[PDB]
Amino acid sequence: MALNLQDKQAIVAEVSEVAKGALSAVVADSRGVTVDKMTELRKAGREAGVYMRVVRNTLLRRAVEGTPFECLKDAFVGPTLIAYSMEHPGAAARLFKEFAKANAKFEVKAAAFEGELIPASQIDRLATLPT
Amino acid sequence: MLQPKRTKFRKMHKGRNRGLAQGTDVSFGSFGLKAVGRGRLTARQIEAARRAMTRAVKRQGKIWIRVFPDKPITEKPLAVRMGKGKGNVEYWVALIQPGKVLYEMDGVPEELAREAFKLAAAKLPIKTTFVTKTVM
Amino acid sequence: MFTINAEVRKEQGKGASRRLRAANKFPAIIYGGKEAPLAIELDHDKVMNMQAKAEFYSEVLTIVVDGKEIKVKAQDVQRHPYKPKLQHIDFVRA
Amino acid sequence: MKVRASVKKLCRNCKIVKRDGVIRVICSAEPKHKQRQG
Amino acid sequence: PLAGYPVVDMGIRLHFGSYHDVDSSELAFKLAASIAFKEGFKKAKLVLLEPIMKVEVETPEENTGDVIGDLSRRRGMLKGQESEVTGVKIHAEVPLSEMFGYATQLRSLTKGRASYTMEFLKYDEAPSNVAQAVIEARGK
Amino acid sequence: AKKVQAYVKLQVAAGMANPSPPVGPALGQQGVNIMEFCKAFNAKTDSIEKGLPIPVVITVYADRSFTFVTKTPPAAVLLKKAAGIKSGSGKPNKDKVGKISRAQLQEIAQTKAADMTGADIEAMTRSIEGTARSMGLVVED
RNA sequence: AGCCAGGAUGUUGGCUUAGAAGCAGCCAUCAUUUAAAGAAAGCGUAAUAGCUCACUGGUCGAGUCGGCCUGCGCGGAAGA
Ligand SMILES: [Mg+2]
Ligand SMILES: [Mg+2]
Ligand SMILES: [Mg+2]
Ligand SMILES: [Mg+2]
Ligand SMILES: [Zn+2]
Numbered sequence: 001m002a003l004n005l006q007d008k009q010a011i012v013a014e015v016s017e018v019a020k021g022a023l024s025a026v027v028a029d030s031r032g033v034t035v036d037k038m039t040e041l042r043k044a045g046r047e048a049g050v051y052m053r054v055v056r057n058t059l060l061r062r063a064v065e066g067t068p069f070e071c072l073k074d075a076f077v078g079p080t081l082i083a084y085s086m087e088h089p090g091a092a093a094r095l096f097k098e099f100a101k102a103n104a105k106f107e108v109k110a111a112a113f114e115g116e117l118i119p120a121s122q123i124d125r126l127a128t129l130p131t
Numbered sequence: 132m133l134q135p136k137r138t139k140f141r142k143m144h145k146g147r148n149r150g151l152a153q154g155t156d157v158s159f160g161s162f163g164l165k166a167v168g169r170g171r172l173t174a175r176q177i178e179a180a181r182r183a184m185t186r187a188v189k190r191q192g193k194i195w196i197r198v199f200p201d202k203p204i205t206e207k208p209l210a211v212r213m214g215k216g217k218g219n220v221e222y223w224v225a226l227i228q229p230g231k232v233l234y235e236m237d238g239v240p241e242e243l244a245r246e247a248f249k250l251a252a253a254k255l256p257i258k259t260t261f262v263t264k265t266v267m
Numbered sequence: 268m269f270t271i272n273a274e275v276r277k278e279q280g281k282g283a284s285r286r287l288r289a290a291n292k293f294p295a296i297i298y299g300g301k302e303a304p305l306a307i308e309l310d311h312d313k314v315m316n317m318q319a320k321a322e323f324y325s326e327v328l329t330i331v332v333d334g335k336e337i338k339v340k341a342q343d344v345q346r347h348p349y350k351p352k353l354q355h356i357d358f359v360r361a
Numbered sequence: 362m363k364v365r366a367s368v369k370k371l372c373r374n375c376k377i378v379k380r381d382g383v384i385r386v387i388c389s390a391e392p393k394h395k396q397r398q399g
Numbered sequence: 400p401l402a403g404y405p406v407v408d409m410g411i412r413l414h415f416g417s418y419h420d421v422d423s424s425e426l427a428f429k430l431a432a433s434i435a436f437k438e439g440f441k442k443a444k445l446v447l448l449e450p451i452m453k454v455e456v457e458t459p460e461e462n463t464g465d466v467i468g469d470l471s472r473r474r475g476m477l478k479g480q481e482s483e484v485t486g487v488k489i490h491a492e493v494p495l496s497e498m499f500g501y502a503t504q505l506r507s508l509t510k511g512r513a514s515y516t517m518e519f520l521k522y523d524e525a526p527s528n529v530a531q532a533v534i535e536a537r538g539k
Numbered sequence: 540a541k542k543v544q545a546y547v548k549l550q551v552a553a554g555m556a557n558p559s560p561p562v563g564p565a566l567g568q569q570g571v572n573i574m575e576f577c578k579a580f581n582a583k584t585d586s587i588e589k590g591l592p593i594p595v596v597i598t599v600y601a602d603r604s605f606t607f608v609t610k611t612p613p614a615a616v617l618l619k620k621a622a623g624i625k626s627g628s629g630k631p632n633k634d635k636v637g638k639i640s641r642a643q644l645q646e647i648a649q650t651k652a653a654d655m656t657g658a659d660i661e662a663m664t665r666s667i668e669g670t671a672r673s674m675g676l677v678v679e680d
Numbered sequence: 681a682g683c684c685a686g687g688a689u690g691u692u693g694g695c696u697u698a699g700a701a702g703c704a705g706c707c708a709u710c711a712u713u714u715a716a717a718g719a720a721a722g723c724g725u726a727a728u729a730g731c732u733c734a735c736u737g738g739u740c741g742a743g744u745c746g747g748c749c750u751g752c753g754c755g756g757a758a759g760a
Contacts, residue, residue, distance in 0.1 A: 027715080028684085028737090030685065034702090036542065036689095039713080042713035045657075045658040046713080054714060055736095055737080081738060230348025266324045267341075312749095367756080373721095383754090398756070463727090477698095480559045480562060480564050480569065482569065489567065544729075548692040548700090548728090549700080549727065565700075567727075568729080595692090598689095608689085610690080611689085611690080613691090627697095627709090628706075628709060629693095629694090630696085630707075636709095639694090654689080666711055669690095670691075670694065671694075672709090674694040675707070
């Protein structure tokens with residue numbers, strides 16, 4: 001029911017959590033299991049939290065309208081099924097790790113765990129300091 | 132079959148069926164079956180439509196028959212010449228004019244009432260339409 | 268608050284009313300109050316699409332006739348017997 | 362088929378067609394829903 | 400007691416009675432026993448158990464649905480699911496008035512490549528209009 | 540290889556292992572025999588459902604073996620054992636539909652938080668609570 | 681409109697509990713697990729399987745979807 005104002009509000013509400021936390025996620029719709037994917041996504045939500053944006057509104061123009069306030073590189077259309085795993089607890093949280101692991105298992109593909117980050121240029125994960 | 136319990140006179144003149152109807156409004160129930168056409172409805176037809184509505188809609192709900200036969204129609208026997216008195220009464224008919232509400236119903240959803248009245252109208256000779264109450 | 272546009276009728280009678288209803292207008296009247304009744308003609312399709320609502324009959328209506336609005340309320344409505352068409356609407360002032 | 366004088370879509374898979382002027386009902390679900398004349 | 404057929408599970412208990420303690424004729428007491436049994440049945444209004452036997456059928460694993468559907472169109476119940484290496488074994492409970500010529504129907508629906516055996520399991524209630532027909536054919 | 544691969548709901552809930560004779564012979568699709576009837580459920584079907592409702596997933600595998608993560612303690616078992624009256628739907632509104640109690644819900648939340656969890660352990664706890672209340676009637680709790 | 685996918689692991693339902701089957705009868709029961717769970721569609725509905733009521737996300741670039749009133753038409757419409 002993505003009406004004009006309803007879709008505008010939903011895009012803003014989805015961008016709010018993503019901008020408040022770490023990078024979001026994506027789950028294309030190619031292949032899922034009856035319980036292997038259902039329980040896997042259930043555990044992904046349990047670890048990530050109750051505010052992950054599993055819904056998909058990643059149309060090109062919709063993103064250019066709502067998401068494109070800052071970091072316009074994410075405004076590019078994610079032409080596939082989208083499910084975002086919010087990650088409040090630090091950068092690239094356990095939800096991000098779960099998406100990275102499920103990129104090659106328990107789902108069709110995680111879109112390489114593309115996400116969105118404020119730097120938008122550090123291809124490496126949040127491991128800048130070796131220590 | 133509907134019929135007057137008692138009648139002042141056995142036979143009645145044929146008369147005409149001119150004019151529009153006076154029972155034009157949905158009064159008792161919520162929905163109603165208005166008449167778009169004109170003609171006679173015998174007690175058999177009225178009763179057949181009543182079976183139709185009652186069986187179509189659930190047993191729940193209230194049905195009013197806004198029309199009563201109260202008109203003795205006669206037929207001469209077969210193989211009988213003309214004259215020799217008027218024919219004896221055979222059936223009773225309610226004269227209908229455009230706008231007369233025949234049946235009303237209440238306690239039922241819109242679509243189920245529409246279906247029941249469609250099934251009822253399939254049993255009647257005249258054109259009929261579906262109407263609902265209106266404020267005032 | 269429903270607003271209707273009406274024009275004062277020129278001819279009144281059976282034939283004139285039939286001509287109005289064929290011409291897609293229809294007659295109506297505004298009586299009551301301290302002045303004499305006013306016979307008007309109304310746009311039938313607009314009046315129907317407006318009066319389908321139940322609030323048309325409890326709310327106060329404003330009929331703009333020859334430039335001046337009249338605050339009125341629908342007292343009675345003559346409906347066509349077997350068609351969705353209104354034949355006449357009575358308006359008591361205020 | 363059915364040549365009834367009143368032909369209706371008897372299920373979701375029926376389609377109304379107007380071949381040769383005649384109004385037919387053609388069904389890709391099961392063949393009993395084939396009708397001939399409007 | 401009903402329609403010339405026997406009974407199971409009844410248990411009798413002579414609790415009271417009267418007599419004279421000189422000559423309690425057994426033959427004369429048999430009339431009392433018969434009348435007591437008749438009044439007892441009349442007050443019981445008990446019903447009939449048809450003969451339902453257990454049928455065990457081995458069939459290929461392609462006509463399983465067809466054979467159990469036939470057994471279900473028949474007023475019969477099923478018991479136990481099994482899958483043989485070379486087929487499937489179904490078990491069912493069916494009346495005796497019914498399944499007359501069941502072998503030919505089984506062969507028809509399984510290409511004559513299925514077998515069945517019978518062992519006459521304990522009975523069950525069955526609504527049949529013939530139970531009263533057989534007894535009311537002779538009036539009262 | 541494939542988990543179960545044949546979901547035939549003609550298997551007894553808890554109770555005796557492989558209760559096919561009561562379950563019915565209208566479920567011959569599954570390859571359940573004397574080998575897979577009590578391969579694991581015989582020794583792992585006492586600490587989960589002891590006289591309490593718990594449907595069991597066979598999890599038969601095409602790798603010439605039967606092995607998988609079996610279902611955790613059932614909600615139909617926990618809420619039934621902690622309610623006393625296991626009644627429910629069928630007579631949901633006209634009579635008792637079994638007791639749905641915060642005690643049973645909390646027991647399920649605390650015990651079944653290992654495997655059978657959805658969007659959270661507490662989420663599956665609320666699942667069991669809904670399964671208890673949705674039967675048609677709930678006790679004061 | 682057309683082309684890429686999803687419907688359970690509390691749930692043989694707590695069940696007319698010998699289930700009547702994650703879509704017989706059934707009560708009604710989001711069941712958080714959501715691009716979704718209705719405890720109900722053709723399938724096998726007595727059962728999985730693979731298409732899948734529904735519904736959505738993606739694909740593609742301008743009309744789209746249906747109801748009401750009315751004008752003229754079509755079928756219904758076979759005889760010596
Ligand atoms: Mg005149
Ligand atoms: Mg015609
Ligand atoms: Mg013609
Ligand atoms: Mg002909
Ligand atoms: Zn069809």
